[PDB]
Amino acid sequence: GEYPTVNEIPVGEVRLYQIADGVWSHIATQSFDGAVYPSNGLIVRDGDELLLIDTAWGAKNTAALLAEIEKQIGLPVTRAVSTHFHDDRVGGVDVLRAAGVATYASPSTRRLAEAEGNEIPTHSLEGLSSSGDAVRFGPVELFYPGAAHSTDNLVVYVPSANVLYGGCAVHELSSTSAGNVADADLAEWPTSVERIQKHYPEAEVVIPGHGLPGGLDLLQHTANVVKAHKN
Ligand SMILES: NS(=O)(=O)c1c(CC2CCNCC2)ccc(-c2ccc(C3CCNCC3)cc2)c1-c1nnn[nH]1
Ligand SMILES: [Mg+2]
Ligand SMILES: [Zn+2]
Numbered sequence: 001g002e003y004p005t006v007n008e009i010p011v012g013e014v015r016l017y018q019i020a021d022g023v024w025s026h027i028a029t030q031s032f033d034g035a036v037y038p039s040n041g042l043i044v045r046d047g048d049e050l051l052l053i054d055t056a057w058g059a060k061n062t063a064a065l066l067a068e069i070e071k072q073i074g075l076p077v078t079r080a081v082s083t084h085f086h087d088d089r090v091g092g093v094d095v096l097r098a099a100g101v102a103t104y105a106s107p108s109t110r111r112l113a114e115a116e117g118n119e120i121p122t123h124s125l126e127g128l129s130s131s132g133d134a135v136r137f138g139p140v141e142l143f144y145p146g147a148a149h150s151t152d153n154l155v156v157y158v159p160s161a162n163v164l165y166g167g168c169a170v171h172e173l174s175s176t177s178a179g180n181v182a183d184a185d186l187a188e189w190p191t192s193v194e195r196i197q198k199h200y201p202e203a204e205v206v207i208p209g210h211g212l213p214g215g216l217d218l219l220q221h222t223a224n225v226v227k228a229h230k231n
C-alpha cells in the first residue's frame, strides 16, 4: 500500500523502494502518446557496489536516479543491464556511461536499439539467445524466457531474496490492457510466461515493468491480459 503511484511522482523525479535486503526498485514517470506512465527498474547490492537493472526512462530521470541512489544508498553504481531495447530501458544509457557505469545488454537488444535509434548499451551479453537461456551476472541471474512484450525481453532473478524482476514482459495485477504491443509476440507470450513460472517457482516478489509489485500471480495474470488483448 506504500509503493509510489504515477500521480505521486512528477516527471523528472525518481523514487526508490526497498524490496528486500540489498534490493530496491526505482520508480520514475514519463510520457507516451501524451499520457504519463510510471516505470520500474531494479537496484541490487553487489558487495560494496550496485548493479542497476534498466534506466529510469530518459536522460533527466536517469540523472535523478543516480542522485537518489547517492543520497539513499551511497554505494556506486558500477554496472547496468537493460532488459529490452525500448526507451524506458535504454533511454539514459548515455547518462550512465558518462557517470562511469558500464552498460550491458544482449546482442538482440543492442541490434534492436540500434535499429530503433535508441541509445545502445556498450557491452554485449552472449549466452541469452535461445529461450530458457540463463547467465549469472554479479548478484543476479539473467533469463531469456522467449518472445513476449518484445523479442529480446529479459527477466532478472535475485536468488538471495527470491525477487523476480519481470520487466515489461510482466504486467501488474490491476492491468486490464496489454500496453504497447507493437513489438510483442502475443502468441508466444503465454509460453514465455510458462517458462518463467517453471524456472522461478520460489519467487516471493514479482516486479512488473510498470506498476505495483506483487507475488507469483502477476505471471498468470499477464498471460490472461495478453489473451484478452489477442481476442
Ligand atoms: N516498454 S514500452 O516502450 O513498450 C513502453 C513505453 C516506453 C516508450 C514507448 C514508445 N517509444 C519511447 C519509449 C512507455 C509506456 C508503456 C506503457 C503503456 C501502457 C501501459 C499500461 C499497461 C496496463 N496497465 C495500465 C498501463 C504501461 C506501459 C510502455 C510499455 N511497456 N510495456 N508495455 N507497454
Ligand atoms: Mg534516444
Ligand atoms: Zn517495451
Ligand SMILES: [Zn+2]
Pocket: 086, 088, 168, 209, 210
Ligand atoms: Zn515498458
